[PDB]
Design a protein around this nucleic acid. Structure first.
Lengths: 185, 83, 83, 149, 129
RNA sequence: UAAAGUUGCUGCAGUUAAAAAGCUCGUAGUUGGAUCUUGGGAGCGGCCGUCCCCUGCUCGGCGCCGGCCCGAAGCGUUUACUUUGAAAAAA
């Protein structure tokens, strides 16, 4: 319906239902001109630790900034529809491998493992924006990124923190926590 | 003192320090909603302006450049805006 | 300090600073070993046991010994966390 | 530590952590570029453009608001100068000093400061020839310099 | 100017541990410093550290025990065959019973003892005991 | 030759013992900031260990109703480095 798969293939009945649920917001509510051109690439249902589920919606990259205007507006209606789930909007960042000895154009820094994993994290937490990354390299050797979100929208998006940590963990495999520094701004 | 919380500088200590030498680099400037009482429009002026920011549709000249922070002309008020 | 058979062969195992872990040599006469007595949490009397602390002369000459006992008694619960 | 001084100054501009645009700034990237074109047409450098913008129009960094930076916005459309602004300003300063030193042969301090400025030029010239943003045939000569305003 | 960033780091945490600091800021940051530190951590010489991400090169904040007698860089990064690695640990460590030359192999930045069992030489970065 | 760390790459010295150019610019020389892949799939021992995988398109053998799995060529950022291999008179 609005779920334009990147490969020449088909969406699932869940994923087509989410894209019809975006038609349900288009052909009823007054954000209808701001859902016509906005397509979807994928969507997944991500079982986080404990008895909780979240829904993750991958998006076309040049259409991402159009979602960033209309984020919480739209997140309300999609989150009450799938009542107990958390709904989050990431762009589908294509991610080229590191050009080796064995294997043509210069691989740009945008399309790189680190810039993908950092730009995902930036537009993972949207209403709050990141005011410092910290990384515990713990005694066993493994990293634990500590993302310091904005003090504004703490009351808005604190409930999504342990979701956000799961959403990022399932995507990249990187163990993350989200904190709120109060002492500056 | 041997033991200092190098990761957790108390905000009294951080605002004291040189901007570059702060644990994370952070400026001492800010944008101002400068409004003159003669005109209607709120202009956005930079604190350390270093130019003569004028009233567009001339009712006055708002700020005058100095060493550090510009002098906001007597009559003008300012809100510091943030994100 | 242990042999192929697993025997402790060194003729004494040294003490070492409860602050900075520096082994406290046989002729460090500046080194300060303190006994801090603990108390019954409703009576307020000496129980008979203590939380013993040992500082190398070096940190004591630096003058940081004060803060180092103050930390070791805070993380030990002897002293108020609020402080 | 400075190039041609004993000065160990630390007067640096210090960008904030958050590269993310602020909220209040209502100008879209296109109208910022349109205003950059308007300043460039008046006859300003990317240094002077950036100052005038952040003062009167509350736009901290053009790179933060748009994607690109002010010379690359000038250069794409062709409002950028033929020879860089900073190497222009040293050649401009060297022509100023050399004019002063035409009728002041006694001014030995000037003559020494001229040699320091000449060295700044040759040093930048050599850099821009590695990046081919000047011709390899180019070389700053002080007799040819007064035509380069 | 600053040229060997791993030198600035190891000298700064050496200076700091001699002074008896519980932790130390090392205020440029490279991936080579971070691999070197993780090697010093695996052998328990330094405590679990922390890389502060500004949007320039990082700053690291390193918890210290009193175990690190000295860390240090070898500049320049000399090439070391498996033949030569005895003569380095002979003249650059305080005993055979402890101390570790870090040397960047192809396999990865690691101690001299793993460079033996992996059977890969490379460039000496530094050493610690 | 060692002793000579009294030629110092390992490894010396240069305030006063011998020693830093009067000062600065400056070309070859030498040295040069940060940054560009990671998570897991397969298996064993008692949470931790040791292994296989994470480039693509002309000629045939474990097979199948023009191609699928795989074998052998040839193109594949370029070097230093490290490990292996060939080859390197004996005395």
């Amino acid at each position: 319906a609005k779920i334009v798969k990147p490969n020449g293939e088909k969406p699932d009945e869940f994923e087509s239902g989410i894209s019809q649920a975006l038609l349900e917001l288009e052909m009823n509510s007054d954000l209808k001109a701001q859902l016509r051109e906005l397509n979807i690439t994928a969507a997944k249902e991500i079982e986080v630790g404990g008895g909780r589920k979240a829904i993750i919606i991958f998006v076309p990259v040049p259409q991402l900034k159009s979602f960033q205007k209309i984020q919480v507006r739209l997140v309300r209606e999609l989150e009450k529809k799938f009542s107990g789930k958390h709904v989050v909007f990431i762009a589908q960042r294509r991610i080229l491998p590191k050009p080796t000895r064995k294997s043509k154009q210069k691989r740009p820094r945008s399309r790189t493992l680190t810039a993908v994993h950092d730009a995902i994290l930036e537009d993972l937490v949207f209403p709050s924006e990141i005011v410092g990354k910290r990384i515990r390299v713990k005694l066993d050797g493994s990293r634990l990124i500590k993302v310091h979100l904005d003090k504004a929208q703490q009351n808005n998006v604190e409930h999504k923190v342990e979701t956000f940590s799961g959403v990022y963990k399932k995507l990249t495999g990187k163990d993350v926590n989200f904190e709120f520094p109060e002492f500056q701004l | 003192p041997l033991a200092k919380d190098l990761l957790h500088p108390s905000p009294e200590e951080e605002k004291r320090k040189h901007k570059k030498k702060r644990l994370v680099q952070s400026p001492n400037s800010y944008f101002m909603d400068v409004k003159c009482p003669g005109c209607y429009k709120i202009t956005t002026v930079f604190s350390h302006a270093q130019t003569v920011v004028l009233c567009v549709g001339c009712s006055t000249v708002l700020c005058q450049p100095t060493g550090g922070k510009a002098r906001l002309t007597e009559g003008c008020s300012f809100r510091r805006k943030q994100h | 300090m242990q042999s192929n058979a697993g025997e402790f062969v060194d003729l004494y195992v040294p003490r070492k600073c409860s602050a900075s872990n520096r082994i406290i040599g046989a002729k460090d006469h500046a080194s300060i070993p303190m006994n801090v007595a603990e108390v019954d949490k409703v009576t307020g009397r000496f129980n008979g046991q203590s939380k013993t602390y040992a500082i190398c002369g070096a940190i004591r000459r630096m003058g940081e010994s004060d803060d180092s006992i103050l930390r070791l008694a805070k993380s030990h619960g002897i002293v108020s966390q609020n402080f | 530590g400075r190039m041609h001084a004993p000065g160990k100054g630390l007067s640096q501009s210090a960008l904030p952590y958050r590269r993310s645009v602020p909220t209040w700034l209502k100008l879209t990237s296109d109208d910022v570029k349109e205003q950059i074109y308007k300043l460039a047409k008046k006859g300003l450098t990317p240094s002077q453009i950036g100052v005038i913008l952040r003062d009167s129009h509350g736009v901290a960094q053009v790179r933060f608001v748009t994607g690109n930076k002010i010379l690359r916005i000038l250069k794409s459309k062709g409002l950028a100068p033929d020879l860089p602004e900073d190497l222009y300003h040293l050649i401009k300063k060297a022509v100023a000093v050399r004019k002063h030193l035409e009728r002041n042969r006694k001014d030995k301090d000037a003559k020494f400061r001229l040699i320091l400025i000449e060295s700044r030029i040759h040093r930048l010239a050599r850099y821009y020839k590695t990046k081919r943003v000047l011709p390899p045939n180019w070389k700053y000569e002080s007799s040819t310099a007064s035509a380069l305003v | 100017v600053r040229m060997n960033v791993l030198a600035d780091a190891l000298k700064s945490i050496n200076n700091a541990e001699k002074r008896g600091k519980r932790q130390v800021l090392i205020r440029p940051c490279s991936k080579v410093i971070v691999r070197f530190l993780t090697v010093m951590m695996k052998h328990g010489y330094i405590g679990e550290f922390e890389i502060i991400d500004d949007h320039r090169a990082g700053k690291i904040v390193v918890n210290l025990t009193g175990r690190l007698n000295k860390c240090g860089v070898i500049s320049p990064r000399f090439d070391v065959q498996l033949k030569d690695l005895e003569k380095w640990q002979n003249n650059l460590l305080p005993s055979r019973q402890f101390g570790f030359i870090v040397l960047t192999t192809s396999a990865g930045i690691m101690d001299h003892e793993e460079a033996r069992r992996k059977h890969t030489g490379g460039k000496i970065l530094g050493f610690f005991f």
